[PDB]
């Protein structure tokens, strides 16, 4: 990367990492306060064959410095690398730091690939035209020549080739002040570099992968100690009912059915109550096209024990009252001739309202026995036609482990 030095707080999300005392060195950038994205080849015995870079601890002690645009000052943060999570297909790895850096923001990821002719920029800590190792990081400029199967081919504009030590460095595209990461530098012709010479300025970078990062950074949002506040609805317009649940942070997170994790009170109930095409969550939170709930509003103008979803005439709720009666609401109807209500659950298209008896027996109402055994005694908040939080607070579906471990 040959161009002007830059220390401005636009590219302060970049990082420099070294492996061992002097074994290897390359560049990277933050995707989270705990995670740094770089190339997998940096951790390979043979950088041209980044296939053996297995997940787990680094083979050699690895350190990273973040935000230190100028190496002659202490400005910036230093962290140790504890774990590596390689990409299953291409030359890309996520590094987990021992401690977070809450002061330096990450760079947003691109939603798509840049097309040929698009003006991209790049920043790194690699070699220059006249220096083996720079004091300050530098910014160059590149254009896209073509797009291929999970990678982007670029070339330098007016010289300025990707050189050495640039591996793992980000490829950036911006619009209206917003920066997105479009790819990561892997290989280059290294023209115009100190100590070497070639005409070509061409380089190849791995294409950015937003889903890979999301399922790594948020890999452990759940599976641990969760609340019983769980509800089902389609929040991604997939035709597959998803699951939302509240974590210890007091926030509601959506897990998408294929459970894969998304990006973003006594009882919680979901469903598309207004038939808007976007699943909702006494106040109603309306769904939107972005999967984000809007501000809630009262559904009406405290002696109810349980409330669950129920479809009426194609659209609804059922409430179990402390008097043992069950009523449906659109205008209300009696769901059962007498006060015979038992744990209330949501519905599912078994052929239907599911219920759990105090003796552990499971049944459904058109009641009929739903499960051969009587082991549902400790089960809470059963949601729906597939169908509990479990004794470990880990959601099981009927009991397959829908949640990862």
């Amino acid at each position: 990367t040959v161009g002007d030095p830059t220390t401005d707080a636009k590219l302060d999300f970049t990082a420099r990492l070294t492996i061992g005392t002097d074994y290897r060195s390359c560049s990277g950038a933050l995707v989270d306060t705990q995670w740094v994205l770089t190339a997998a080849s940096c951790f390979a015995d043979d950088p041209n064959q980044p296939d053996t870079v297995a997940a787990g601890k680094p083979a050699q002690l690895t350190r990273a410095t973040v935000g230190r645009a100028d190496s002659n000052i202490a400005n910036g943060y230093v962290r140790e690398v504890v774990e590596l999570v390689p990409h299953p297909e291409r030359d890309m790895v996520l590094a987990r730091l021992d401690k977070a850096i809450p002061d330096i923001a990450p760079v947003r990821l691109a939603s798509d690939a840049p097309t040929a002719g698009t003006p991209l920029t790049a920043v790194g800590f690699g070699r220059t035209k006249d220096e083996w190792v720079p004091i300050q990081r530098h910014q160059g400029a590149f254009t896209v020549t073509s797009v291929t199967a999970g990678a982007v081919n670029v070339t330098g504009q007016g010289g300025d080739a990707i050189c050495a030590g640039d591996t793992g460095g980000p490829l950036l595209q911006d619009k209206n002040g917003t920066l997105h990461l479009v790819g990561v530098n892997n290989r280059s012709m290294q023209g115009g570099c100190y100590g070497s010479e070639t005409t070509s300025t061409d380089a190849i970078a791995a294409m950015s992968d937003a889903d890979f990062v999301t399922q790594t950074v948020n890999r452990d949002l759940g599976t641990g100690n969760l609340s019983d506040l769980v509800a089902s609805a389609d929040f991604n317009s997939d035709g597959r009912t998803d699951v939302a649940a509240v974590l210890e942070d007091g926030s509601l997170h959506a897990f998408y059915a294929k459970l894969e994790y998304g990006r973003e009170m006594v009882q919680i109930i979901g469903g598309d109550f207004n038939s808007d095409g976007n699943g909702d969550i006494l106040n109603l939170y309306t769904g939107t096209a972005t999967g984000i709930l809007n501000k809630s509003k009262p559904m009406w103008h405290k002696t109810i024990k349980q409330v669950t979803r129920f479809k009426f005439n194609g659209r609804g709720l059922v409430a179990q009252w402390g008097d043992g009666n069950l009523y449906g609401y659109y205008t209300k109807v009696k769901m059962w001739p007498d006060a015979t209500w038992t744990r209330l659950t949501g519905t599912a298209d078994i052929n239907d309202l599911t219920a759990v008896r105090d003796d552990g027996s499971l049944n459904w109402y058109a009641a009929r026995k739903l499960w051969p055994d009587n082991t549902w005694t400790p089960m809470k908040r059963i949601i729906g036609g597939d169908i509990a939080v479990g004794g470990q607070s880990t959601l099981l579906l009927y009991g397959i482990a829908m949640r990862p471990a």
């Binding site: 002097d22 290897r24 060195s25 390359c26 190339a39 080849s41 940096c42 950088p47 041209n48 190496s71 002659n72 690699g126 070699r127 220096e131 083996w132 190792v133 004091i135 990707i162 050189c163 050495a164 030590g165 640039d166 591996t167 530098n185 892997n186 290989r187 280059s188 012709m189 290294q190 570099c193 100190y194 100590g195 070497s196 061409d202 380089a203 190849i204």
Partner: protein
């Protein structure tokens, strides 16, 4: 096919230098560069092999470069102490600490008269 842009700390252009100056270079921390001797001198090494002499420039401290120069005899320093490792013909190595802003010699021009080889050039820091 393009090479990986990964730094192995191997001195850039070392292959060319061996051919042109006669000096050879291995690994370092990247903060020492070989340059010309024309008013830009920092650390200067003299020998009786290759192109007689050559200069190195310190970019930052600390720094080191494990270069090899046969039949070395003299070193110049400037604005910095220099720690130098040399080796005899029998494989035995020793360390000589050169003061800043002065000139010192090695085996050949030192106390033993031995035709020693320069092994390590290290910048204090």
């Amino acid at each position: 096919e393009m090479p990986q842009a990964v730094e192995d700390f191997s001195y850039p252009g070392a292959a060319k230098i061996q051919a042109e100056t006669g000096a050879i270079l291995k690994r370092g921390n990247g903060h020492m560069l070989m340059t010309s001797c024309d008013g830009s001198e920092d650390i200067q090494v003299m020998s009786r092999t290759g192109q007689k002499d050559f200069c190195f420039n310190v970019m930052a401290k600390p720094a080191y470069l494990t270069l090899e120069v046969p039949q070395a005899y003299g070193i110049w320093t400037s604005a910095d102490p220099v720690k130098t490792t040399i080796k005899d013909t029998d494989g035995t190595a020793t360390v000589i600490n050169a003061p800043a802003n002065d000139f010192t010699g090695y085996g050949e021009a030192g106390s033993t008269g031995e035709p020693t080889t320069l092994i390590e050039l290290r910048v204090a820091g």
